[PDB]
Amino acid sequence: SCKTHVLLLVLHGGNILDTGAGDPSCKAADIHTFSSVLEKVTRAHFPAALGHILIKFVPCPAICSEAFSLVSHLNPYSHDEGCLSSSQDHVPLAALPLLAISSPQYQDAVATVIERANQVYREFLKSSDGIGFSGQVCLIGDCVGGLLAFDAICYSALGRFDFDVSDFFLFGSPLGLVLAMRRTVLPQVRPACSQVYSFFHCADPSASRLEPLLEPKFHLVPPVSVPRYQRFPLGDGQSLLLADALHTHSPLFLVGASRITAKWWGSKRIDYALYCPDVLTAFPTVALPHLFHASYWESTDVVAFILRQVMRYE
Amino acid sequence: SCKTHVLLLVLHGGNILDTGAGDPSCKAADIHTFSSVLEKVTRAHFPAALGHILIKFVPCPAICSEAFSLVSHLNPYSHDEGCLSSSQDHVPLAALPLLAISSPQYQDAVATVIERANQVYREFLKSSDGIGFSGQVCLIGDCVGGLLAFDAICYSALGRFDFDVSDFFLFGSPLGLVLAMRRTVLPQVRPACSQVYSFFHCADPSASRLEPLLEPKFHLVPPVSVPRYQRFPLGDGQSLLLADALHTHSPLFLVGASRITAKWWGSKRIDYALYCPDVLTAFPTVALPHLFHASYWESTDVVAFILRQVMRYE
DSSP states (O other): OOSSSSEEEEEEEOOOOOOOSSEEEEEEHHHHHHHHHHHHHHHHOOGGGGGGGEEEEEOOOTHHHHHHHHHHHOSSSSOTTTOOOOTOOOOOOTTTHEEEEEESSSHHHHHHHHHHHHHHHHHHHHHHTTTTTOSEEEEEEEEHHHHHHHHHHHHEOOOOSOOOEEEEEEOOOOOOHHHHHHHHHHHEEEEESSEEEEEEEETTTOOOHHHHHHGGGEEEEEEEEOOOOOTTOOOOOOOOBBBHHHHTTHHOEEEEEEEEHHHHHSSSEEEEEEEOOOOGGGGGGGGHHHHHHHHHHHHHHHHHHHHHHTTTTT | OOOOOOOEEEEEEOOOOOHHHHHHHHHHHHHHHHHHHHHHHHHOOOGGGSSEEEEEEEOOOOTTTTHHHHHHHHOOOOOOTTOOOOOOOOOOHHHHHHHHHSSSHHHHHHHHHHHHHHHHHHHHHHHHHTTTOSEEEEEOTTTTTTHHHHHHHEEEOOOOOOEEEEEEEEEEEEEHHHHHHHHHHHOOOOEEEEEEEEEEEOOOTOOOOHHHHHHHHGGOOOOOOOTTTOOTTTOOOOOOBBBHHHHHHHHHHOHHHHHHHHHHHSSSOOOOEEOOOOOGGGGGGHHHHHEEEEHHHHHHHHHHHHHHTTTTTO
8 A cells, every 4th residue: 555665764863973953954865875876776776676776864973973072083184173184094083982872971872863863754754755654664764873773672681662663774883892882880781683794995084893792703704795776686595594604604703603693783794884985994094984984885796685685575 | 317208109901902811020130220221310319218128020812912912803994813913014003902991890990900909009008118108109000000000099079099199100001092982972070199100102103192182282282291311410400390381382271370270180280201312213004012111211301300290299
């Protein structure tokens, strides 16, 4: 009945250097660009999806504001008020998410995200495109929004989203570092979703693997290489299944297989490395969080990958 | 009576990438190199100090071991067991001190350092060089040892050192980042010493200013430039006093002057930037913590500076 089969809900929190009140047009511009890539890839190769996948977004609070001010005041190099210096090659970017999630007010940002996402979902259900919706809701979190999205669906084994999450995609999010901090302070939390797919460019300062936090020996298993759309528009035929990694690397892991499988966040691999044009690596450190953030919204590699995953429901 | 007028006690904890049991000969080699620089500068320009300044060291625990393992397992790049990859330009070095001090066992490392320092001090007092000692004890902390040394002398306004600390020198220590984390979680702690001098090379990944944590507008006052011994073996004649910075930058700060002066850690500036040979900047990120760590023990710039400070007691 309903024309929308899959709702892609984007939790847009910006990147680790964003501060203050965001520009709402900037968030909408990101989503418009992403939506145009989705439509183009859909027409070229997934015509059965045309008109059936809808994108909505949720603006998240900029939880790195105070952390940015502290890091900027720690900078040994000369700089102007409210600024970093591009000469600081090793600006401590990894401290920004850690300071952000350590704030006593971080939990309030999570509660706010849940409230805004439920309002967006409810308006969708009343809209013409949402009447009679019975499909899948996938979550997409950007660099910072991914952190909030994860904490919003996590449980042990503030309210809650009004929907059940199927696929959960993370765009260059430093979640791994955050979870390493939380394990250090308080030494299983798992997300309530059908699968986690965490994308990163290896050279992104926020690139953080999650698989070795579930099973440490995965640090010796390479991340999955996402196929370049230009060469493999239909994918490269790889199964993506955890069981294939366990089977191929059985000496490393193998009760072993069942214990790892039980604690995994889905039946597929979690760590996905994206092809990184060499141009992106020619920039000073302070420019990289925005450049990597912006890359996702126009990535045909990422969009084609997402589309392939939502076809087991067709 | 006693031939030793100043005891320089070095808390040697290594750098943020050190793990496991240290090589004791390595720590002793560092201290021997430092001691030889001290003797050479002393003979050239402080002959009244010859034979009257003694160096002792205290090996500290390698509190970054577990953090190193986590960061190494987060690395998106291919690497070997127990290793970082030099291709990871933005390895999250800033996470290492933060994970280290967040461990529930960090407080036990501080207690252990206090115990070992008191044993070293007691053996010194029994030695021929220490009988009748009535002089000053200065503390020197290296990158990691500085963190432990600071927490050992801090109080609000585990045991304690058996001595009172005069000057406290920090060699490229990420204390500022640690204190920014602690202020974020629990939003005055001050060290029990006559003065803090925190040295850094601007390009050192652990370089972190402390002055803006005491007074935020100091982020717009440059750190003090340490004179190069090659050109200014006797110093450049600068007072180093906080009051001179407040006076010269009075519009920024000025009850203001008295409140800032009261919360400062001594009467002198705290942030000291060292000249950095360009060679040190030609190295990949994973090599920099050791290279910067090693630089201090052979630095005539640092040694001449230290010697000038211990002359107000002559």
